[PDB]
């Protein structure tokens, strides 16, 4: 009875493992020009937070930033546009709204461009039993949230009721939307990642590589993504391949990865570690290119503009640095 | 060389900085305390005696403001959100002290105390231990099967020897005897001096921290 079902699931696992088992990217990428040495220096230093910052998000126009306080920045000239009285940040594509959520198990939406020159809460979405790990604005009216309830949710701003629930063990720690805003990926603490379908409401694919995953980001193309685990290893997965391409690890580092992001054209993979500094790997190569040193504590967050003009990093010390 | 607009766009940033600086100094005059006891040991029964997710409670005592964070029903992995409580002044741990007869959640309390005390983030955070439930424990001394959970224990029927043995057993789990220090109170249901003990403990730890920062220690 139950043993028959166990054998059935086991042979499903065997058949899928046999079906996904070619070529190696690390060996086909041979005879290519290395980037060399990449040594971007700090261009702006941002002060004002008196805490360990935990999240940030670049603006849509690659000039505004958002970082018990929520600060809007100005990366060109260092000015505080507005301060609003947490583990997540989100900046709406239209620039009208921002989102924040943390251990309180609710996510709050703030409206920026209003009359009376004030920012006030527009929605307080609730329904999770856990802690929110990541939030992203799908549209101006739709937002997706991944929390520690082992489930993800697709919401609706105008009516706070949940629209879709994604389930299918451990806390989900990171979340990333595809460039076309039609697919969706999430990595959990059970050493697994999953690709879902927002329109359907059902899981599409799963990837297993080990320890908990706490960083994930889509490739600019939208057909691959990168994950960062706590075993001091970063990995790249392909949607159309259902496999793992390479491990971004070195023998001298035994420190986990806190944040991961790409650059435009998908050549430089910037990983913010917990060893007081970030690293700049060559996404197509197995060798490190550059190091972004200058932080005096654990690097938590990291972001790259849409035009790829600047890279903003924050750490457990209250200073947020904009490099170029 | 600034424009007419930008010169007026810098005064706004200066006012924002002033507001943040003035508001940032009101959060440095409050003491952070973390409730981390067992779920059914009496955490809900101790918050009311002093006065979804994390619940913050505010106390005032001798012109000192206390913030106490109760992580009641998070029901998640403790290793993924325990980073947020680094720098908390003290951790108030509560033990039922009458939960040894489940056979056992007494060993669960022992394991939880071992996990929290030897944490890497809490290597210098003092722990205040409250051995609760004196009423039932003292009333059950007539037929207490305390030797069941303690095979190596031999002692008199008086509550004093058993209480001393169990307290020494909880103190024995500490591995950092140079920085950390476990405080005990033996709280009762009908006490009134519970806040006094925590006030004295936080004063002691703050004085020791000041001495360590100054250079004498």
């Amino acid at each position, epitope marked *: 009875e139950l043993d028959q079902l166990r054998q059935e699931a086991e042979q499903l696992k065997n058949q899928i493992r046999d079906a996904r088992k070619d070529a190696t990217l690390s060996q086909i990428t041979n005879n290519i020009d290395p980037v060399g040495r990449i040594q971007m220096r700090t261009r702006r230093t941002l002060r004002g937070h008196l805490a360990k910052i935990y999240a940030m998000h670049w603006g849509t126009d690659s000039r*505004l930033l958002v970082s018990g306080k929520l600060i809007i920045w*100005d990366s060109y*000239t260092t*000015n505080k*546009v*507005h301060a609003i009285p947490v583990m997540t940040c989100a900046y709406a594509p239209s620039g009208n709204y921002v989102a924040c959520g943390g251990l309180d198990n609710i996510c709050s939406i703030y409206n920026l461009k209003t*009359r*009376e*020159g*004030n920012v006030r809460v527009s929605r307080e979405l609730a329904g999770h039993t856990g802690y929110l790990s990541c939030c992203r604005f799908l549209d101006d009216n739709q937002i997706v949230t991944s929390s520690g309830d082992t489930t993800c949710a697709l919401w609706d701003i105008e009516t706070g009721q949940q629209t879709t629930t994604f389930t299918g063990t451990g806390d989900v720690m990171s979340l990333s939307l595809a460039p076309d805003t039609r697919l969706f990926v999430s990595g959990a603490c059970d050493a697994s990642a999953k690709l879902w379908d927002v329109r359907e409401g059902m899981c599409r694919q799963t990837f297993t590589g080990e320890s908990d995953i706490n960083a994930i980001c889509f490739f600019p193309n939208g057909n691959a993504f990168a994950t960062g685990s706590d075993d001091a290893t970063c990995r790249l997965f392909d949607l159309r391949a259902d496999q793992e391409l390479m491990t971004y690890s070195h023998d001298n580092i035994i420190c986990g990865i806190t944040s991961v992001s790409f650059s435009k054209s998908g050549r430089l993979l910037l990983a913010g570690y917990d060893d007081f500094n970030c690293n700049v790997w060559d996404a197509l190569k197995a060798d490190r290119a550059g190091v972004l040193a200058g932080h005096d504590n654990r690097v938590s967050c990291l972001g790259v503009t849409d035009d790829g003009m600047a890279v903003a990093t924050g750490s457990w010390d209250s200073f947020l640095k904009i490099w170029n | *060389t600034l*424009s*007419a*607009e*930008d010169k*007026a*766009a810098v*005064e*706004r940033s200066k*006012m924002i900085d002033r507001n943040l600086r003035e508001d940032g100094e009101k959060a440095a005059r409050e003491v952070k305390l973390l409730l981390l006891g067992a779920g059914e040991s009496g955490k809900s029964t101790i918050v009311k005696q002093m006065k979804t997710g994390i619940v913050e409670t505010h106390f005032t005592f001798k012109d000192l403001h206390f913030k106490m964070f109760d992580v009641g029903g998070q029901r998640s992995e403790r290793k993924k959100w325990i980073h947020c409580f680094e720098g908390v002044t003290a951790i108030i741990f509560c033990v039922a002290l009458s939960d040894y007869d489940l056979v056992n959640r007494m060993h669960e309390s022992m394991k939880l105390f071992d996990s929290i005390c030897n944490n890497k983030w809490f290597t210098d955070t003092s722990i205040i231990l409250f051995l609760n439930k004196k009423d039932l424990f003292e009333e059950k001394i007539k037929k207490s099967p305390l030797t069941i959970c303690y095979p190596e224990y031999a002692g008199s029927n008086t509550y004093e020897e058993a209480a001393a043995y169990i307290q020494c057993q909880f103190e024995d789990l500490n591995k950092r005897k140079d920085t950390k220090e476990i405080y005990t109170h033996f709280t009762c249901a009908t006490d009134t001096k519970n806040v006094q003990f925590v006030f004295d403990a936080v004063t002691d730890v703050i004085i020791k921290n000041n001495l360590k920062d100054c250079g004498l220690f």
Partner: single-chain antibody
Amino acid sequence: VQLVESGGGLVQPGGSRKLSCSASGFAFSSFGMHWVRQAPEKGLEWVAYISSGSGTIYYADTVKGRFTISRDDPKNTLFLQMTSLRSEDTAMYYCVRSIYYYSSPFDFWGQGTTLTVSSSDIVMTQATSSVPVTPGESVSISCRSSKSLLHSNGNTYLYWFLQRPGQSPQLLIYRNLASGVPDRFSGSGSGTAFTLTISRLEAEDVGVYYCMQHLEYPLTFGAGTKLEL
């Protein structure tokens, strides 16, 4: 949302009086507040500008050291003390507000109050003045700036306030189009040449337009013909 201006000017020469204004539904503590005047046959020119926190009290170049501004954030009240009133004070005063992010200054205008007395400036001239609006057609306004209004910030200053026959003006372009119901309004800029364009006329489209000729501390862009007649 609402700005109520009070204080009626009818005094003998050599007197003084106050002009008050009260704001509702604002973060008045975080809005800069200007004061503007309009003569019966003239444009809209500054008389004072006040910044948030009372750190910038710029006054008028025509009259300096006689008028003063006082502000009350708890009372949400902004008012003007006038001294040594002369014969040439017979204008309509408005109490426009503005705020500068890193966004649409002069967005809201008050009702204004009358003042009558009993008995480095950019200037532009054109042959065509007070062009009547032809029904069933499209009207366009062309203007030229004496200097280059474009600044190294890249933000050329282009204001096109519209004043209908009535009580208070409106904003059309704040630098383009503001948060207004109409859409047909367009503004084209190229160096020193600027053009306001109307896609189609309407019953409420008729009015008087005012130019932009301001870069420095005195924003005297009021040079403009009155198209009322």
